[PDB]
Design a protein around this ligand. Structure first.
Ligand SMILES: [Cl-]
Length: 235
């Protein structure tokens, strides 16, 4: 029953979303800290991680994107080091030798590809909120209510171990009809706000600094009345 799931609010207010605590599978380096909101049969998972110590992983088992909501994490792999504070994001490629060093009481949203579908692209990739973007495809004209927007993106990470493309996107305002989502999508809003109207006839307002996950097949209407900029992970 694919749906739209609010993973975390900017102010860490309660979300309606149910999370399953524990490792996603027998390879997950996280367990008590892993809070999974969604996993599909083909291995895409989304949720949050609560963690407050360091752990080292010899070969990271997933391709995994982290979006910080509280605290701080420093990711180290050999001579590479990336520190993420609230609002910052990075990707751990599949196979990366990585140390994940969280300050106490840290919390991040995640999207992981837990199934490999091609060769590892290992390493850590930081994702700049202010990345420079180039024109990207608006929605299908046939589903539009408003005029077509101008959209831009930058695929800062293009996996070869999955179909994940991860980056930054922006758009002028638009409105379209409800459609089942064509792909899996994590979004974290850098600027603006969007209203997602849902299969059950309810509404989710995604505000600046919130992270939401839209499962493939989830019926979703998009309405934005202003500019939106987001981090994304899409399959
Ligand atoms: Cl854990």
């Amino acid at each position: 029953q694919p749906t739209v799931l609010l993973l975390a609010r900017a102010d860490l207010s309660p979300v309606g979303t149910e999370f399953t605590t524990g490792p996603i599978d027998a390879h997950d380096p996280f367990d008590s800290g892993r809070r999974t909101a969604f996993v599909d049969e083909q291995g895409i998972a989304a949720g949050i991680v609560e963690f407050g110590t360091a752990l080292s992983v010899e070969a990271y088992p997933y391709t995994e994107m982290l979006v910080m909501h509280r605290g701080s994490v420093t990711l180290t792999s050999g001579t590479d080091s990336v520190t993420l504070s609230t609002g910052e994001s990075a990707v751990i490629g599949r196979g990366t030798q990585v140390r994940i060093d969280a300050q106490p009481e840290s919390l991040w949203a995640f999207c992981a590809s837990t199934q490999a579908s091609g060769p590892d692209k290992s390493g850590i990739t930081a994702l700049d909120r202010l990345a420079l973007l180039t024109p990207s495809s608006p929605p299908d004209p046939s589903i539009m209510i408003s005029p077509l927007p101008q959209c831009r993106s930058n695929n800062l990470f293009e996996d070869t171990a999955s179909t994940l493309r991860i980056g930054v996107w922006d758009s002028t305002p638009y409105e379209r009809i409800s459609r089942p989502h064509k792909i899996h999508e994590l979004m974290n809003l850098i600027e603006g706000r969007v209203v997602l109207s849902l299969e059950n006839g309810s509404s989710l307002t995604v505000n600046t600094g919130d992270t939401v996950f839209v499962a493939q097949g989830a019926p979703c209407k998009w309405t934005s009345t202003g500019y939106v900029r987001k981090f994304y992970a899409v399959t």
